[PDB]
């Protein structure tokens, strides 16, 4: 009830040299395991924005002579540059749960995370506020999302049972 | 009461004829609404009356009325079927008629034989057999189960349909404009 | 078979009796909300006068001018006579009483009222004139933005009961009206209503003979009741008026002609007297009010009231999806 | 000088409810409400003749 | 007249400023951000204080998955 | 104070519709055979008035509650046969 | 399960059961006796029913014909609960469904007539009327007291009898 | 599937030999999507399923779309040239 | 057979019999003096039919979903938000460029008097 999968699933089926962690995790858990260096991503896109900008600005000006852009063309550059950010900091989180990059550090965090749902004596994956035909519809919408970040931004937010993962 | 998809199928061919030949071009708009709405009555003849309702919302109340619109306070010249015209395009338009009607046909058969692809578009004569079965315990209509698919298994269906709604509105817009 | 053509001519007789007085009832109260009298010199309290109007002017000389396509100028008056009065089967007075019991009910509402934009624009292609056209066009693009607006007040009344049956909305709302919640509504919609009929208050363009001018005249009126119909239904209470189980419970032991009687004469006066109170009220706001520019009228429809109903949009499905409600088919 | 918009009593909610419900319209409506309760002013005119002074011509 | 300050300027001025002189879309935007912003943050506390969800309705009928067992009755 | 003669037209129309909603009541009433109409019909419905229509025996709502059917219900059963749908 | 449109013309057959399957007798229950009773057929014959829907599953395909054996039981064991309900509850079974008639079929405005049967049929026939699926901490809609959905009028035969099992102290 | 066919056969021949205006041809682009719609439908309620429904409902939409798109391209040309020729653009 | 076409045929036996009433009744006797290029036109007035459109064709859009709306419960309502929000966006695109108005072209000629 509510958390039988009532599918045929890939089992530990890695995408890369090393384990899976999640076919889809949750966006919550995504930004729970971004390392140091995912953030330095994020800050390193919000500032370019800007610095792009003023950049191609002191190559070639607008109309002619040099000015600095407006403060109105640095605030959206800056939005923007946090949305390049966030957006490649979720991709190469999501690659660590996935299997095809180094995820050593966030192998640990899981087993000692799914121990301790063990021993809460609660569901392994959420208990989902969704009838079980939905949760799969909706977690096969979202399964693979990552693949196609260029067109559109797409993200997991459901508790489905299955993560292509055994017991 | 047996013919009436047939009379509705007639009467559709009448009225493509007097579409394309028609004195006035908004003479030749209505006969549109009026196919329009033959076309309604098919779609409630088969069992679809949802859609014919649809029909008379989408199709007459908004791209018909922006049709007449249009046709109003713009200058449209317009030649009338003349004979001089029109007979140098007949021979043609015989054999295209023939060729592509046939044509049309012939996809729905699945034969190695040409003739016998197209004589199974008219074997048609056998009465289904509609049974009973018990197995549906509520009101799930059409409009409902399009509104489940559209909106879990083809949601991006819907996203990217709004995306082409949005750009019916930006593209008019940025048309007909003039920007100071 | 008797049976159902004795229904639908009493039907009729009903309704194309009632337009009629509505036109006596409007003289009448804009008068003496002028301080004088309506009229009283056709009928022994100034009834049939209406009749007396119909009367001479189906006795007028109908004039087809020389810029005219003649058949389009006569029948443009039928095809807005006749969907001004078909939409008059849907309505409940009372529970199932309808001229045709069809479980989508609001989607056929919707769609014949989507139909009576056509014999303005078309009728504007009679005679002709550079001036007969753009009057014609300033008409029909307020008919059709308004009727977006009432499109959309529908549709955010049927996510309430998800269904387009008309008399399932109205057993639904014998819990509480749509208008006590939602009375910003209310207020949207009448004055949607008071644009799609193009009433003076709302009006631009106004500011024949004989049979294109008493279809059009009773077009107009049967849009006036039909709109207020629709009002009816999905907004106020159909045809419920309070719980009425007590009364019978004295009067009455056992089921009777004469109680099923009496239980329709309680649904459709509640109807009516929503219906009469809405129609007075459409007169009351004409009686008070200067007219519109074009620009005002745009700009009140397109750049005021749409934004807000898409607010309403965003707010009416968030709350109830914050308590777990949602309407089951 | 005329008064900008933040040097004003009024506060935005207190004059945005009298924008989006519309109480002088309402007010100009109870007027003729008012109007519709009371006594017409018609007089019938080949059974009763208004004014006379003797001067008229 | 009263010119536009730009949001960027001052937030809370701009804000004031929208509603004093263009309510129509101040409100409108006021209403449409009150729902899916209190679609985010009160739902999890209707589920934990007011009431927990309601139980699904059924759709088919509820097969259960077993192998038959046999049952003495109406045997005739 | 209030015109008697202002809102008697409206006496009229409410009386119209009032009396036509009224006898359409009781027509609905004499053509269902005493009870009221059912006012929205599932599919599920629609094929349960037809089988009640085939147990009661020609009356359309008569609803028979016996224990064990008749004779004539087994041979009685109906199939539709639709039309080739040119 | 598609509904048939574009002139259905209606047709029956002349035959018979052929020897290999026994006869079985029928319900003669229509809609609002099958309504009424509904809970009380699913209260005795669930691992009836649930055996033949389950037969259904099991032998894909083959459906009517491998499944009549117990598709007899299920309408045998329905037909044993409707006379059952009959020989001891006849008057107020009837004063229930006859409620049902009127008002669109709708449990939601016969209360008091199925307050009756439900007392009746659980002291004689001992079958609960109850709701599966509803956890605890969840009301079942017929015990409510002051629900929001009453109907238009409550019949006059139940109310009657309503008041006169409150005066016995039946109810 | 003989409605939709000559629908789309005979608004397609209309539009062909369309040489006396230009929004003949609009409206036999129209009939030619009204008789795509037609073929589909009828193929939808004979399969017993939806998703020739969803197509159809998805294709109203994009005609819709095309007719709005499509007429405020005339209107363009039309601003230049305040006649529109019978011989075509 | 039913109630619903007797009443879809008689309204317009109702229009043909009071036409030809008054057809039938009335004089016609016209004569000359009874009887009797192209204008240009602003962008707005073709701008509020040709987008009054892709606005109606999203008011029908959530007809599918307003029907649906118990089944989809929790995941359609979020698809359906995504969806409005996208079109709130080019709404407010078209009230940010002031699309629809019609403005008139002659001011009170702000510009200053000035000398020698
Ligand atoms: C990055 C951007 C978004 C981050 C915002 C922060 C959200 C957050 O952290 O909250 C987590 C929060 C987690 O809750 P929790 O209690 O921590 O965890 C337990 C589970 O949530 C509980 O799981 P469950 O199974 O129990 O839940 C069932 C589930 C079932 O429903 C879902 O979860 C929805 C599934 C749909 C997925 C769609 C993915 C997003 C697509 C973006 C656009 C795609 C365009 C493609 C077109 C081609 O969700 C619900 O029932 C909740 C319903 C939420 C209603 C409120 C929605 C408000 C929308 C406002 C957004 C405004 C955006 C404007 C942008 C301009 O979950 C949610 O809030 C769900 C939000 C759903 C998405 C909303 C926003 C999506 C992003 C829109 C724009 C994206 C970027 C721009 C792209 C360009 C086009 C717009
Ligand atoms: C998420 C997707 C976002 C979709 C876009 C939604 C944008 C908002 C729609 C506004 C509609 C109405 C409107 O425009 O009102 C303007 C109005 C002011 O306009 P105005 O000054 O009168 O207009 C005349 C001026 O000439 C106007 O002066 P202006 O030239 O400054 O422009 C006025 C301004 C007016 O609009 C705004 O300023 C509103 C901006 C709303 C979005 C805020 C995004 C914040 C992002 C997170 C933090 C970023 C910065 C972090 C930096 C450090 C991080 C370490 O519009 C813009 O500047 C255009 C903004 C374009 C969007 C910027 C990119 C947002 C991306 C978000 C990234 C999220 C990351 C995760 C998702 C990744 C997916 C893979 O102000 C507001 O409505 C403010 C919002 C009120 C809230 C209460
Ligand atoms: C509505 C009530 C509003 C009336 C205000 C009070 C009455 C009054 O005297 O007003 C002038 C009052 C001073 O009047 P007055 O000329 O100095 O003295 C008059 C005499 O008392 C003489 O006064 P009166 O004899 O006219 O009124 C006496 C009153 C009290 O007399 C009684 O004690 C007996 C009460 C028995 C029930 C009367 C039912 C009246 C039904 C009226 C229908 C709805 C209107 O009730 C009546 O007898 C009126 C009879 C009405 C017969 C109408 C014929 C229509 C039949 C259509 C058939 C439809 C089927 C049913 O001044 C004001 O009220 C100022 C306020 C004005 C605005 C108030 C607007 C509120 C109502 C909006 C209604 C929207 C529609
Ligand atoms: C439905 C009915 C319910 C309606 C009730 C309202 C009753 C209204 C009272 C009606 C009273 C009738 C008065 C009508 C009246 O002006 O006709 C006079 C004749 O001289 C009579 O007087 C002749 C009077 C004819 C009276 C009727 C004769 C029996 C019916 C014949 C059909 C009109 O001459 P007319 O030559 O111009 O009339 C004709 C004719 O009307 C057109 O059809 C011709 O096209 C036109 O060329 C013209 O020549
Ligand atoms: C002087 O200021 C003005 C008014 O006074 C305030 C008006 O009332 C109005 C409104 C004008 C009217 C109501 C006159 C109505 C004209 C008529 C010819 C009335 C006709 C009556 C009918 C057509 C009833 C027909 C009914 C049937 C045929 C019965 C069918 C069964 C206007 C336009 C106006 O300008
Ligand atoms: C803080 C309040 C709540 C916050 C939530 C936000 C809104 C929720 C409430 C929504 C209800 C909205 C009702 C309609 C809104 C009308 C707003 C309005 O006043 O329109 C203004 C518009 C022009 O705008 P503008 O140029 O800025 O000038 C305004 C002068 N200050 O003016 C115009 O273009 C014309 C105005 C037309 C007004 C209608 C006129 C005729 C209709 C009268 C109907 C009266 C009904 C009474 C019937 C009584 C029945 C018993
Ligand atoms: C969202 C869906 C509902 C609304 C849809 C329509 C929105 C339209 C927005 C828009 O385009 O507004 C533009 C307008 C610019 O005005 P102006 O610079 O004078 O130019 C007018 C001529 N173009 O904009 C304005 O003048 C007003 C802009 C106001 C933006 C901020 C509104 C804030 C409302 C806050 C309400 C309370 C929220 C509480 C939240 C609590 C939890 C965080
Ligand atoms: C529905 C209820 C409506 C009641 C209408 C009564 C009006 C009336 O009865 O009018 C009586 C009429 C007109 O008489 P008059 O001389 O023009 O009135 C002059 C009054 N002064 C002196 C005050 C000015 O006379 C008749 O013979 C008409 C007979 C046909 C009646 C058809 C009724 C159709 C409804």
């Keep these: ?108 965090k899981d087993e000692a995370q799914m121990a301790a749902r063990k021993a809460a004596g609660l569901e392994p994956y959420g208990t989902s506020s969704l009838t079980p035909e939905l949760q799969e519809i909706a977690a096969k919408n979202s399964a693979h999302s990552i693949a196609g970040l260029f067109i559109f931004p797409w993200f997991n937010f459901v508790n489905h049972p299955y993560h292509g993962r055994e017991q | 009461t047996y013919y009436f998809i047939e009379i509705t199928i007639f009467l559709a061919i009448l009225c493509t004829i007097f579409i394309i030949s028609a004195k006035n071009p908004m003479v030749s708009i209505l006969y549109m609404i009026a196919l329009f709405v033959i076309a309604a009555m098919y779609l409630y003849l088969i069992g679809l009356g949802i859609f014919s309702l ?27 079927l003349s004979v001089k015209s029109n007979i140098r395009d007949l021979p043609l338009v015989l054999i295209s008629l023939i060729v592509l009607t046939i044509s049309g046909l012939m996809i729905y058969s699945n034969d190695s034989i040409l003739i016998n692809k197209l004589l199974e578009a008219f074997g048609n004569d056998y009465n289904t057999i509609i049974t009973q079965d018990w197995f549906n315990i509520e009101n799930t209509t059409l409009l409902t189960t399009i509104g489940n698919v559209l909106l879990t298994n083809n949601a991006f269906i819907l996203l990217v349909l709004a995306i082409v709604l949005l750009l019916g509105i930006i593209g008019p817009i940025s048309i007909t404009m003039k920007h100071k | 078979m008797i049976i159902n053509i004795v229904e639908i001519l009493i039907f009729l007789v009903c309704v194309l009796f009632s337009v009629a007085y509505l036109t006596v009832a409007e003289r009448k109260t804009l008068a003496y909300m002028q301080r004088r009298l309506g009229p009283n010199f056709v009928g022994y309290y100034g009834l049939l006068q209406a009749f007396a109007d119909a009367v001479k002017l189906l006795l007028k000389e109908i004039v087809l001018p020389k810029e005219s396509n003649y058949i389009i100028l006569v029948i443009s008056p039928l095809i807005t006579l006749i969907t001004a009065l078909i939409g008059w089967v849907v309505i409940p007075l009372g529970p199932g009483i309808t001229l045709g019991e069809l479980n989508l009910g609001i989607l056929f509402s919707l769609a014949i009222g ?59 709302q014998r819990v509480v009206w749509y208008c006590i919640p939602l009375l910003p509504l209310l207020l949207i919609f009448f004055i949607a209503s008071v644009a799609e009929t193009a009433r003076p208050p709302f009006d631009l363009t106004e500011s024949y003979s004989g049979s294109p001018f008493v279809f059009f005249f009773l077009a107009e009126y049967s849009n006036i009741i039909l709109i207020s119909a629709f009002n009816g239904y999905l907004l106020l209470g159909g045809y419920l008026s309070f719980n009425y189980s007590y009364l019978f419970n004295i009067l009455f032991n ?18 009516a007297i929503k219906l009469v109170f809405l129609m007075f009220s459409f007169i009351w706001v004409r009686a008070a009010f200067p007219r519109f520019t074009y620009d005002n009228l745009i700009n009140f429809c397109w750049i005021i009231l749409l934004p807000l109903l898409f607010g309403i949009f965003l707010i009416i499905p968030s709350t109830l999806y914050i308590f777990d409600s949602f309407p089951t088919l | 000088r005329p008064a900008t918009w933040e040097e004003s009593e009024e506060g935005a909610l207190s004059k945005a409810t009298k924008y989006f419900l519309l109480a002088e319209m309402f007010r100009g409506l109870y007027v003729v409400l008012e109007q519709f309760f009371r006594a017409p002013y018609t007089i019938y ?8 002074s003797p001067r008229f011509r | 007249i009263n010119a536009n300050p730009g949001f960027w300027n001052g937030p809370f001025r701009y804000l004031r400023w929208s509603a004093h002189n263009r309510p129509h879309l101040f409100f409108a935007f006021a209403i449409g951000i009150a729902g899916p912003v209190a679609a985010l943050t009160l739902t999890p506390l209707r589920r934990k204080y007011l009431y927990p969800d309601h139980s699904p309705l059924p759709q088919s009928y509820p097969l259960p998955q077993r192998a038959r067992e046999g049952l003495t009755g109406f045997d005739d | ?56 025996g020609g009356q359309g709502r008569k609803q028979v509650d016996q224990a064990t059917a008749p004779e004539a219900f087994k041979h009685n059963h109906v199939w539709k046969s639709e039309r080739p749908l040119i | 399960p598609r ?50 829907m389950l037969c259904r599953e099991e032998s894909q395909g083959s459906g009517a014909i491998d499944c009549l054996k117990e ?67 969840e009301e079942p809609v017929f015990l409510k007291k002051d629900p929001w959905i009453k109907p238009a009028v409550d019949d006059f035969k139940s109310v009657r009898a309503y008041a006169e099992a409150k005066k016995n102290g039946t109810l | 599937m003989f409605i939709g066919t000559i629908i789309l056969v005979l608004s397609f021949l209309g539009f062909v030999f369309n040489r006396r205006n230009i929004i003949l041809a609009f409206i036999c682009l129209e009939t030619m999507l009204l008789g795509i719609n037609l073929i589909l439908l009828r193929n939808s309620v004979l399969f017993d399923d939806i998703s020739g429904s969803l197509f159809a409902i998805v294709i109203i939409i994009l005609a819709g779309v095309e007719s709005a798109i499509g007429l405020s391209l005339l209107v363009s040309y039309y601003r230049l040239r305040g006649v529109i020729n019978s011989y075509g653009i | 057979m039913n109630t619903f076409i007797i009443f879809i045929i008689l309204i317009p036996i109702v229009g043909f019999a009071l036409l030809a009433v008054n057809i039938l009744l009335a004089v016609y006797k016209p004569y000359n003096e009874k009887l009797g290029t192209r204008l240009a036109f602003n962008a707005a007035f073709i701008l509020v039919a040709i987008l009054f459109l892709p606005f109606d064709l999203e008011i029908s859009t959530l007809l599918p979903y307003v029907m649906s709306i118990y089944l989809v419960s929790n995941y359609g309502f979020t698809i359906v938000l995504l969806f409005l929000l996208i079109l709130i966006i080019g709404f407010v695109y078209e009230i940010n460029t002031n699309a629809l108005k019609i403005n008139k072209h002659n001011k009170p000629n702000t510009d200053s008097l000035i000398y020698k």
Aim: aromatic share 12%; proline share 5%; with cysteine.
């Design chain 6, 1 to 56: 104070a209030i015109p008697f003669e202002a809102l008697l037209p409206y006496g009229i129309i409410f009386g119209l519709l009032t009396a036509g909603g009224g006898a359409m009541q009781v027509l609905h009433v004499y053509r269902n055979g005493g009870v009221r109409d059912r006012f929205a019909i599932d599919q599920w419905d629609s094929q349960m008035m037809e089988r009640d229509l085939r147990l009661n």
């Design chain 3, 114 to 172: 989507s139909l009576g934009v056509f014999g303005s624009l078309l009728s504007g292609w009679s005679s002709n004139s550079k001036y007969s056209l753009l009057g014609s066009i300033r008409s029909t693009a307020q008919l059709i933005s308004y009727e977006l607006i009432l499109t959309s007040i529908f549709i955010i009344i049927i996510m309430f009961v998800s269904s387009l049956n008309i008399t399932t909305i109205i057993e639904t």
């Design chain 3, 254 to 271: 056992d089921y009777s002609y004469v109680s099923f009687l009496f239980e329709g004469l309680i649904n459709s006066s509640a109807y």
């Design chain 4, 45 to 52: 005119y080949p059974f009763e003749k208004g004014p006379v």
């Design chain 2, 54 to 80: 649809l029909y008379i919302m989408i199709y007459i109340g908004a791209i018909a009325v922006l049709f007449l619109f249009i046709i109003t306070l713009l200058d449209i010249n317009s030649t009338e």
């Design chain 7, 71 to 137: 598709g007899r039981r299920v309408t045998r064991c329905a037909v044993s609960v409707i006379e059952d309900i009959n020989k001891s509850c006849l008057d107020e079974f009837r004063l229930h469904w006859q409620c049902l008639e009127q008002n669109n079929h709708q449990l939601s405005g016969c209360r008091k007539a199925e307050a009756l049967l439900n007392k009746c049929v659980f002291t004689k026939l001992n079958l609960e009327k109850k709701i599966p699926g509803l956890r605890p901490d």
């Design chain 1, 1 to 108: 009830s509510s958390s039988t999968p009532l599918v045929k699933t890939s089992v530990n089926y890695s995408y890369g040299d090393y384990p899976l962690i999640d076919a889809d995790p949750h966006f919550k858990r995504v930004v729970g395991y971004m390392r140091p260096s995912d953030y330095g991503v994020i800050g390193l896109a919000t500032a370019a924005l800007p610095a792009g900008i003023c950049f191609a600005e002191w190559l070639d000006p607008v109309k002619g002579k040099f000015a600095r852009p407006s403060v109105k063309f640095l605030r959206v550059a800056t939005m923007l540059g946090f949305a390049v950010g966030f957006g490649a900091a979720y991709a190469r989180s999501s690659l660590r749960f996935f299997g095809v990059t180094e995820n050593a550090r966030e192998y640990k």
């Design chain 7, 3 to 52: 509904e048939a449109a574009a002139h259905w013309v209606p047709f029956e057959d002349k035959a018979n059961m052929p020897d290999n399957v026994p006869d079985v007798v029928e319900v003669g229950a229509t809609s609002a006796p099958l309504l009424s009773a509904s809970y009380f057929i699913g209260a005795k014959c669930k691992p009836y029913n649930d055996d033949f």
